[PDB]
């Protein structure tokens, strides 16, 4: 096994209090001879599924709890098993954002929200309103200020703006049926985004860094971040507010709200320590504060200090304009709905996309593993039991039955074609239980890979895997063929994500064999 016993290596994000956590690191080594590695690895969200999947990683990871359901999934989280008085000390919303399928898979931290902030000698009242900015900045360019600076090139920055007018990922009623990307409320809010772009009020390429340092240099009256943040402010000696986000046609700003929690690796052989050390040194006062006076946490997921911090202006300020947001969703699809908006936000002010063009994208990168699942599961078991779901699909189901089909019609020739080549391929395999379906993941992922990418292909991965549910259903062994469909959903929108973006999703698919 990779990881090394008898130390703790951690991974936290580089905007965070890291030297605070490397001191309460510290600490625990004091007591317990346990030394412990806090590193801040680059892009380290996307890192610790690659590496944390082949037995590899930081034996914690720190993530706000959006990513911890698609590795919790992966099955690259220890479940974690605090007592009841331990659950006690954190408050018990905190928890809920580390719940996936009823397991908690993360300690809480510290609940997150993007506020307003605002240069208080350039700007004693910060506007109500994302309308008025661009007049605030005409005013403020006549003194060579800016109004507003904030990153770009994170969609967590745009996302407050995007789902002020009725922007959402997933409706929570977590339909994950109901994407809200592309609606008229995100056209609204990405759209008054991008008119500031156009008008010279933004600039596309302001990422951290840029929209940090000018604000930092009193350069632009107000940028949008988070508790982090606030640090480098003092730092800097702007006279600074946190206040309310504005709104946006009447409505507030919502912003995603994050709960920073720490993970426990799978594969890690220290998880006993990790636990002592989560619980009983960073989620304590002590620890809490080491991390906090480094980089503010935000509202601390620990009552006790919470309640101290609680009297805080720029903590009611972040709680204000968490209680108008959103707690993000932990489900498995939030990376690939974050990358989607992502390269929505970026291409929409960069304008190589209109925001129309870039909002449909990435409500069909969001949606893309559903609605795949959803054609797949469904071919696959109405192959194997030879009767179609009578369930409906959503109302944004047009597409997944005309694919399904598509897939029934395109489908049935490449099995007939190919069931001497599949029986032959199937009867090398021993394809018995649930344990062979996903070394089947391995094989046809690489089989998949080797070739061309065309439709075709696609077509052929999916009759494979219908031939393959039908042999689990003559066996028995029905109960396989959802954890088969979704293996090969992985594999197809893993590797070909950007590809069936380009396509169009499975609309490409139905019109390349129309
Ligand atoms: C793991 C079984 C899978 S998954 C899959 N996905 C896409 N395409 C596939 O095969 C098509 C025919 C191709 O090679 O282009 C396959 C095959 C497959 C099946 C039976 C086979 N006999 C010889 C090769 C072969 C390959
Ligand atoms: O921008 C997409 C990104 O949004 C959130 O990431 C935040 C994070 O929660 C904060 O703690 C801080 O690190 O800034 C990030 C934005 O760069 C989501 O948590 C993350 O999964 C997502 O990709």
Aim: negative net charge.
């Amino acid at each position: 096994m990779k990881i090394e016993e008898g130390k703790l290596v951690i991974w936290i994000n580089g905007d965070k209090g890291y030297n605070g956590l490397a001191e309460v690191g510290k600490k625990f080594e004091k007591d317990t001879g346990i030394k412990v590695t806090v590193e801040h690895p680059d892009k380290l969200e996307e890192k610790f599924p690659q590496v944390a999947a082949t037995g590899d990683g930081p034996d914690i990871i720190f993530w706000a709890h959006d990513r911890f359901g698609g590795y919790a999934q992966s099955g690259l989280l220890a479940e974690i098993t605090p007592d009841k008085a331990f659950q006690d000390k954190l408050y018990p919303f905190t928890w809920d954002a580390v719940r996936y399928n009823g397991k908690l898979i993360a300690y809480p931290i510290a609940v997150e929200a993007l506020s307003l902030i605002y240069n208080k000698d350039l700007l004693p009242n910060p506007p109500k309103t994302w309308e008025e900015i661009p007049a605030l900045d005409k005013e403020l360019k006549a003194k060579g200020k800016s109004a507003l600076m904030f990153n770009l090139q994170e969609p967590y920055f745009t996302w407050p703006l995007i789902a002020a007018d009725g922007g959402y990922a997933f409706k929570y009623a977590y339909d994950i049926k109901d994407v809200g990307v592309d609606n008229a409320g995100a056209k609204a809010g990405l759209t008054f985004l991008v008119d500031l772009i156009k008008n010279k009020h933004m600039n596309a390429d302001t990422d951290y860094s840029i929209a940090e340092a000018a604000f930092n240099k009193g350069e632009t009256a107000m940028t949008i971040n988070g508790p982090w943040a606030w640090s480098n402010i003092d730092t800097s000696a702007v006279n600074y507010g946190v206040t309310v986000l504005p709104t946006f046609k009447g409505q507030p700003s919502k912003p995603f709200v994050g709960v920073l929690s720490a993970g426990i690796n799978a594969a890690s052989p220290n998880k006993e320590l990790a636990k002592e050390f989560l619980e009983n040194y960073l989620l304590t006062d002590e620890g809490l504060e080491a991390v906090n006076k480094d980089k503010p946490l935000g509202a601390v997921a620990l009552k006790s200090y919470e309640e101290e911090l609680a009297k805080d202006p720029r903590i009611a300020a972040t709680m204000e304009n968490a209680q108008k947001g959103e707690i993000m969703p932990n489900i498995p699809q939030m990376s690939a709905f974050w990358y989607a908006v992502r390269t929505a936000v970026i291409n929409a002010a960069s304008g190589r996309q209109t925001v129309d063009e870039a909002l449909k994208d990435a409500q069909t990168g969001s949606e893309l593993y559903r609605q795949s699942l959803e054609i797949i599961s469904r071919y696959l078991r109405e192959q194997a039991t030879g009767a179609a779901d009578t369930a409906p699909m959503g109302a944004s189901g047009a597409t997944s039955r005309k694919a399904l089909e598509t897939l029934r019609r395109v489908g049935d020739g490449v099995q007939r074609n190919h069931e001497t080549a599949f029986q032959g391929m199937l009867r090398k395999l021993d394809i018995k239980n649930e344990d062979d379906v996903k070394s089947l993941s391995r094989v046809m992922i690489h089989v998949f890979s080797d070739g061309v990418t065309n439709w075709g292909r696609i077509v052929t991965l999916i009759s494979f895997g219908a031939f393959v549910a039908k042999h689990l259903k003559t066996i028995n062994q029905e109960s396989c063929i959802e954890p088969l469909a979704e293996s090969i959903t992985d594999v197809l929108v893993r590797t070909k994500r950007d590809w069936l973006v380009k396509q169009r999703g499975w609309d490409g698919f139905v019109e390349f064999f129309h």
